[PDB]
Amino acid sequence: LDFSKDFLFGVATASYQVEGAYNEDGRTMSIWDTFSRQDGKVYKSHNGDVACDHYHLYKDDVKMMKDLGIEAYRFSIAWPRIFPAKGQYNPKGMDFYKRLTDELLKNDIKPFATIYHWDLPQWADDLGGWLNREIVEWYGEYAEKLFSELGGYIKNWITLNEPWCSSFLSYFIGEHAPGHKDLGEALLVSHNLLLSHGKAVEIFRGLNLDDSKIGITLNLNEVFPASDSDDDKVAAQIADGFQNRWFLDPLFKGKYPQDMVEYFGKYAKVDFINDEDLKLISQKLDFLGVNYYTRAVVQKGGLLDAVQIDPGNERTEMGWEIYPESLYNILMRLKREYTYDMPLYITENGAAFNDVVEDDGRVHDEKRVEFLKQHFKEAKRFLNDGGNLKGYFVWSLMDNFEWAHGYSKRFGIVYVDYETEKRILKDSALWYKDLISTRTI
């Protein structure tokens, strides 16, 4: 077999992107409910009030996954369902994740739970959010409650999804909630996110849950200089430090990357760095989840102003270059520089294309079939070169709410007709079903 029977073929979603039921069974608003109601923040003022209605349709969706042969399901847990007010636990919110995970297990699907996938409760943001160091304790209490109530259901835990997005994209670029534009704030948020991750790991190890694993998920790219010039080499180094090393180094080396500490320090405070915090941040993990989509080609441009070059190759509807070799290059880089023999999962990879249901009732998404084929071939090549890849989760199970793009970008292997909430298997889902069945590519 190209992929062993123990290899996990998975799919992934996130709570606010698919669940809907935004005001039901005690759920209160997250920063994204609020953000999507602010004019100009989200495409056509789309929001996740209803999304895919997965909260109500979860049994049908699990049956769909079973019929595809899905072996693992990565989802996130909505903090505002579990603690809809500070210190106020909501058993009805917990009950959803129990019946969801009970359904998954009874259909032979391994649950992978993301504790935080960007839907911070509005009550927490009103108290300062990720800028308030006290969030470390709020997050730890939330995580401990999940570990204690769901530890018999879920054995694979992910603390945070893509902390680069929750920090720089949300507080510096301002495209994501809460939408600040302040480099110093983004840097502090990145530190408090990592410290909160560390607190959850410390709680996790103290519980000593049998056969349970914990990790984190990072979106990673590969940065190419546009030319062999020294200017473009420095630009690539900064861009690589900004996207990848700012998170990889504290997690796996116990130290922020010094070139970036000095670079950022020309523009903002970096005084949050201290030894005690970096010891918590760098606690040993059981696995690393890698979210990979594309590379960047950069030339010198100013503060983080590298011009992004278009190398003229095929792209997705996001404008992201289709460059499968960087999946292998990034996995090898981790093996050789950061994670060594530690298990790796691809916790997201996928693509947005202009999907259309044709008169035959089918979605002939050939470009997504070819995209996934090329990237799974690179995963296979990593394995046959000795990489410790344990699974691969396609983003996404279904079309969903794509953050600032609303519903205009479709990432699913399953098409959702939002008017009816009908699920339509795309050709990529049928291709994936065959890959799982044959384990051959």
Ligand code: NA
């Ligand atoms: Na939602």
Ligand code: NA
């Ligand atoms: Na809205």
Ligand code: NA
């Ligand atoms: Na580790």
